[PDB]
Ligand SMILES: CCCCCCCCCCCCCCCCCC(=O)OC[C@H](COP(=O)(O)OC[C@H](O)CO)OC(=O)CCCCCCCCCCCCCCC
């Protein structure tokens with residue numbers, strides 16, 4: 016899909032969603048294509064119109080670089096989106112770790128971002144359920160509980176784990192909260208299971 | 213009653229005049245409720261059809 020020059024081998028995410036005139040139904044898009052084939056005499060003018068349609072796409076299509084979260088190859092690619100849905104994962108030749116190389120995960124596995132199962136609000140364990148609580152009240156609850164177990168049994172009885180799936184800033188903030196805030200050294204990640212030996 | 217000519221106009225501050233004119237605009241909206249609904253549907257159907265996004269690409273780039 017990445018190496019195809021034309022739209023011959025292209026992701027279904029782009030199909031019917033990239034531009035404005037391409038979401039038209041095929042039963043009513045193909046006759047328009049035949050009309051334009053039989054109408055325009057020189058490719059220059061309709062090519063300019065297609066360049067305008069490319070500029071059209073440029074506004075709605077957001078192309079931002081990112082690095083795949085799944086595995087440690089750290090392949091970097093642009094993620095062509097239209098609002099919130101992910102249309103394409105386009106690698107670039109300038110990508111250091113992969114260039115154009117990509118796997119199924121990093122190039123077609125990003126539907127989890129827009130998944131409805133995603134936790135949009137903080138959840139607090141109320142009785143035997145998870146109540147959708149406000150951000151501020153959840154923050155106050157966690158802070159108060161951590162202060163309680165920090166000033167009762169000491170910070171040494173506090174242990175926090177950062178995700179190896181999160182950015183460097185995230186793990187640095189975990190370890191700073193443990194040491195520069197809580198005062199404990201009990202921190203780890205999946206690397207204890209993965210890269211510690 | 214004696215002879216008095218001067219008129220003490222009521223002190224309508226900026227807040228009161230703004231509220232009165234906003235109420236007038238709201239009443240005008242009320243008179244054209246169906247028209248406003250039709251125009252909102254206009255925008256909705258244009259945006260769904262991509263006409264409004266097409267113009268958004270036209271005027272953004
Ligand atoms: C007296 C009447 C005067 C009218 C006077 C009318 C005056 C107003 C202008 C109307 C035409 C605007 C431009 C429409 C074309 C450009 C935009 C476009 O290409 O947008 C694609 C979209 C595909 O739709 P899809 O849903 O498939 O795709 C949705 C998403 O793109 C993907 O999700 O086009 C449409 O929706 C069609 C819109 C209406 C076109 C009407 C053409 C004839 C108008 C004149 C005759 C009217 C006679 C009425 C009376 C008989």
Ligand code: SF4
Nearest residue numbers: 019020021022023065
């Ligand atoms: S953008 Fe034009 S030239 Fe490229 S694949 Fe699509 S139709 Fe063909």
Ligand code: SF4
Nearest residue numbers: 083085089090118121
């Ligand atoms: S694109 Fe594939 S190989 Fe590259 S980092 Fe993501 S999951 Fe790993």
